[PDB]
């Protein structure tokens, strides 16, 4: 018959990353998670206690709860036509930070600098990010570089 288990069909999913087997390195446990941090869930197949279901692999959530060995995680899960807000209990082997907030705070501070700097510079800030523009004009110099005429090439077997 059919089988739907708790860890069912996770064969390749919890595997241990070839030549990364063995004991977990110890900066995993030196990392301090706080309420309001955003973290990414990648399971660690060697640590069974505190291990999230195969739905939460790769999902990203916020820390509402900090406890002895574990942290709280709020996920938004699609069921039916709506999103439910899930709370999860996971040990810090299965968590790590997501760098989008580190990079976001780096740009927040730079934006603070530029503005307050530009506050004595008479505005004209241009503090947004703008997409890659169409490339402006230019003049190539053929001097030293001569256009090399190319043409299609005949067919051959070469077997």
């Amino acid at each position: 018959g059919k089988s739907h288990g708790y860890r069912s069909r996770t064969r390749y999913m919890f595997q241990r990353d070839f030549r990364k087997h063995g004991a977990v390195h110890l900066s995993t446990y030196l990392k301090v998670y706080k309420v309001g941090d955003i973290v990414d869930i990648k399971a660690n197949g060697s640590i069974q206690k505190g291990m999230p279901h195969k739905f939460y692999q790769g999902k990203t959530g916020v820390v509402y709860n900090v406890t002895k060995s574990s942290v709280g995680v709020i996920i938004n899960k699609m069921v039916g036509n709506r999103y439910l807000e899930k709370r999860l209990n996971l040990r810090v082997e299965h968590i790590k930070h997501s760098k989008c907030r580190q990079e976001f705070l780096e740009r927040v501070k730079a934006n603070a600098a530029k503005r307050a700097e530009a506050k004595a510079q008479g505005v004209a800030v241009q503090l947004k990010r703008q997409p890659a523009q169409p490339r402006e004009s230019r003049i190539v110099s053929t001097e030293g570089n001569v256009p090399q005429t190319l043409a299609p090439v005949p067919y051959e077997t070469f077997i």
């Binding site: 509402y64 900090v66 036509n81 709370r87």
Partner: peptide, 23 residues
């Protein structure tokens, strides 16, 4: 296709969330 008629509504999340589950 039925799912997007009223279309995947959001958490409607609040300031001051519930302390259910907190230490």
């Amino acid at each position: 296709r039925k799912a997007h008629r009223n279309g995947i509504k959001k958490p409607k999340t609040y300031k001051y969330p519930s302390l259910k589950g907190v230490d």
